Amino acid sequence: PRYWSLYYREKIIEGMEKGMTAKAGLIAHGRGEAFDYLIGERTIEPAERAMRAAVAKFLLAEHPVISVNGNVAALVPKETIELAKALNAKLEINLFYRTEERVRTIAEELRKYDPEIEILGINPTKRIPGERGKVDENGIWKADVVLVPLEDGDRTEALVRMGKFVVTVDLNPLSRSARMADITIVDNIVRAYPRMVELAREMKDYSREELLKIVGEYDNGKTLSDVLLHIRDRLTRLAEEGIWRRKEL
Amino acid sequence: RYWSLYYREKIIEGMEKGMTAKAGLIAHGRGEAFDYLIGERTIEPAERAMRAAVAKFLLAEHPVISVNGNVAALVPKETIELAKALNAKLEINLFYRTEERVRTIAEELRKYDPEIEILGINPTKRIPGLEHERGKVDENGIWKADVVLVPLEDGDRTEALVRMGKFVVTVDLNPLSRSARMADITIVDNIVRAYPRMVELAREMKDYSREELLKIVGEYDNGKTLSDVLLHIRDRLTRLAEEGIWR
Ligand SMILES: CC(C)(COP(=O)(O)O)[C@@H](O)C(=O)OP(=O)(O)OC[C@H]1O[C@@H](n2cnc3c(N)ncnc32)[C@H](O)[C@@H]1O
C-alpha cells in the first residue's frame, strides 16, 4: 500500500543525489502525493478516459513529442522511452529549472535504458514565445502534439498560446497546468505511463476514423469536473463512514 | 504566499545543514498542498482539536513533546514555548535517525534556550514493533509518557505509540494519512499556526480545574472531527472550482 509511495519517494531522492531532480522537484512530488491521497492512489475512470483521448490524439499526430523533466527521469525513465516508441514520438528533455548538467545527467540516465534512443533538447536553439524557455527546433518547436507532464502552469500555458495541442499528466486537477492543457490526465505518472503504453498497443490497428471518434467525443473540462466530483463523493463517503482508527482506506 | 516561500526556505536550509531529512522536503510539499486545500488557516475543527489536546496535556502526569527535523526548521522556538506552557519534556525523536542530526537539532533548540533539557540524545528503550534506530525512545521521555505529541509523523510510528497504550496527539495537515487516522487527537492545521495557538490556549486554561479540563476532553470526538475536516475540504474544493482561472 504505502510501500510504493515510499519506493517512489526514495526514487525521487535518488534522482536529486544523481543530479537529475531539482529540489523543487522534491516539493512537487510531495504535492502530488497529497492529491494522490484524494483520488485514492489509483487510476480513476476519468483518468482512463483522458488517457484514451491522449493516446488517440498522439496516434493521429504528425509530429508528436514527449517531454522529460527531472521528476520524470527519476520516476519513469524506461516507461517514458516505451511510451515514446509506442506513440512514435520523439523524446525531448525540457527543464523548468534548467542547467546543462541536469540535462546531460538525464540524457545519460535515459541512455542506460536505450543507448541508441534519440534525445532532443541537449542544445535547444529556438525559444517558446512566452532567459529560460528554449526548445529543440526538431522537437517541441515543430511538434503539433506535445506531452508535458508534471509541468509548471505558466509553461503549459505558453506552449498552448504557441499553437500546440497540450497533453499533461497532473495529480492536481485545480492547477493552472491542468486547467490550461487540452487533455489532462489526473493520475500518478507512475501509473499513467504504463497504462498509456498498453492503450497504444490496443489501438495500433484502429483506423483514423475510430481514432477521430475517440478524440471528438473528449471534453477536458467535463473530465476535470468528473475528477473533482469523484473526489468530493469519496470525501463524503469517507466522512460518513468514518476514518478514525481505520487500517486502510 | 509570502510566508509560504519563507517556510519553504527554512526547510530547504534545514536540509542543507543536515538537520531536516530529505524526505522532510517532500513531506513539506505534501503539507503545502493540504494547507492550500483547507484554506491556509486554523479551521474550527483544528481549534476544536487543539482545545482538547491542550486540556489533555494539562491533565497528563508525564507529558512529552516530540521534535523532528521538520519541527526543528519550522518552529524551534514555538516548540520550546509549548513544552514550557504545558510543563512537558522535549524529546528529539527522528524517523531517519543519525547522531549528527540529533546534535544539529539539539543545537538549533539551544539557540533559543541554552539551558533547555533535551531528551532523545541517548534513547535506550524500544517501541514494540519498531526496528533499529527508528524504534528507540528515551527512558525518561516518551517511554514513561502518558500523553505525547508527535507532529508531522510517519503513521507506523504514531500507531506503534498508540499500541503501547500511550495517548497520542499529532499535528498533521493530511487528514487521510495513517498518522492522522491513528492518533487519539488529530490537529489538521499547519504547525506554524498550531503551536502558537496551543501556547495561547495553555495559558488561558492554566487555572482550569481538572474537572473543566476533563469536560473538554470528554466532549471531544476525534472521529467526528476528522470527518468534519474532510467535509470542510470537500466544500472548499467545490467553491475553489469557481474561485480562480478556468478552462
Ligand atoms: C516538477 C518541476 C519542479 C520539475 O522541474 P524541472 O525538472 O526543472 O523541469 C517543475 O515542473 C514544477 O515546478 O512543477 P510544479 O510543481 O509547478 O507542478 C507539478 C505538478 O505535478 C504534480 N505531480 C507531482 N508528482 C506527480 C506525479 N507523480 N504524478 C502526477 N502528477 C504529479 C504536482 O501536484 C503539480 O500539480
Ligand SMILES: CC(C)(COP(=O)(O)O)[C@@H](O)C(=O)OP(=O)(O)OC[C@H]1O[C@@H](n2cnc3c(N)ncnc32)[C@H](O)[C@@H]1O
Ligand atoms: C516528516 C518526516 C520525514 C520527518 O522525519 P525525521 O525528521 O527523520 O523524523 C517523517 O516524520 C515523515 O516521513 O513524515 P510523513 O511524511 O510520513 O508525514 C508528515 C505529515 O506532516 C504533514 N505536514 C507537512 N508539513 C506540515 C506542516 N507544515 N504542518 C502540519 N503538517 C505538515 C505532511 O503532509 C504529512 O502528512
